[PDB]
Design a protein around this ligand. Structure first.
Ligand code: ZN
Ligand code: ZN
Lengths: 154, 154
């Protein structure tokens, strides 16, 4: 039955992101809002741990229960938490989040509940950037905003 | 397999609270510390929602999958999220969290992953106050600190 999750992002950028899933087997629909982003593409990933003891750093790496290399959302090889990029059209504006993903879930082994959503400083190169961080982080640089993913009402 | 959860408080008071569970059948040991509490007892509860969109208010009521009355942790009738009181020995000091509970879990229906740990302004009367509010909130009053319970490493 329908599950909802929510994430309150804070840091250099901020906003609230929602996760909706109709049933166990359906894709997770990501909606909501990120405000204050610099114009351009920003890496948008679910990280392994819901640990905020050391800023966004203690979130660890991208959520990766299948133990794969980094990729884009449509890559054959990807981390479960690989949600690609969100793109700010202009500076200091409000960016709408609109993603549908079949790998992340709000139930089971791929559940993102109690993990961390992280917005990065730089574009995610989808594992195709050719340099050494590309197959782990997408070379998406620093962690500009994060929050723990919580269970939400209705 | 052993599980760990963590919660970083945000509000009038600070602290990091940890949760440990050896098996799915074993109790949860709650550890860590809260800094800055006023002298006396303070309500200490897991609330239903890991929703931080409106501070600690959007967390909903005490986590209560059985829909029972409020109680102390040792009361026969209680909410799953009823962890009683954390007590500050003096003003503006360090309060040790040291709890073992058989009702909260890090797995299954009573899992507190992705929910919210809340510290209240007033003592929890453990459902023994003689009225309806007592049997609902323990009359623990305002929500002075909270954070989402996230998954932790090892
Ligand atoms: Zn990745
Ligand atoms: Zn209660």
């Amino acid at each position: 039955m329908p599950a909802k999750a929510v994430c309150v992002l804070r840091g250099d950028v901020s906003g609230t992101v929602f996760f909706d899933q109709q049933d166990e087997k359906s894709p997770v629909v990501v909606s909501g809002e990120v405000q204050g982003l610099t114009k351009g593409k920003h890496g948008f990933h679910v990280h392994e741990f819901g640990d905020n003891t050391n800023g966004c750093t203690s979130a660890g790496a991208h959520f990766n229960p299948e133990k794969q290399d980094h990729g884009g959302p449509s890559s054959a090889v990807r981390h479960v938490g690989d949600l690609g990029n969100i793109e700010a059209i202009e500076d200091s504006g409000v960016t709408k989040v609109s993603i549908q993903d079949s790998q992340i879930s709000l139930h089971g082994p791929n559940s993102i509940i109690g993990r961390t959503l992280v917005v990065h400083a730089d574009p995610d190169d989808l594992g195709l950037g050719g340099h050494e961080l590309s197959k782990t982080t997408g070379n998406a640089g620093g962690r500009i905003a994060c929050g723990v993913i919580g269970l939400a009402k209705i």
